């Protein structure tokens, strides 16, 4: 549910759409997530490793 459970009741969102909202938050347009989603996920999975 991303930030929504902090401000009210938890509202579900797909996790890749949560990451798109984040990307807009850092000033990178949300298409840069969806055009690279498998890489962004592989980078995150490697970083957690």
């Amino acid at each position: 549910s991303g930030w929504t459970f902090g401000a009210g009741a938890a509202l579900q969102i797909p996790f890749a759409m949560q990451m798109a909202y984040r990307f807009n938050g850092i000033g990178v347009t949300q298409n840069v997530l969806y055009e690279n989603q498998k890489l962004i996920a592989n980078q995150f999975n490697s970083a957690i490793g």
């Binding site: 797909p14 890749a16 969806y34 055009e35 989603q37």
Partner: protein
Amino acid sequence: VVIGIVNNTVYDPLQPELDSFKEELDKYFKNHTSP
């Protein structure tokens, strides 16, 4: 390229604002058959 993309129409507000101007243009020809 995008995972989970869906098919839907995207409307263009410039299009009927062009197309009702085609119907204006076309009525000028259809009448100007006559003089």
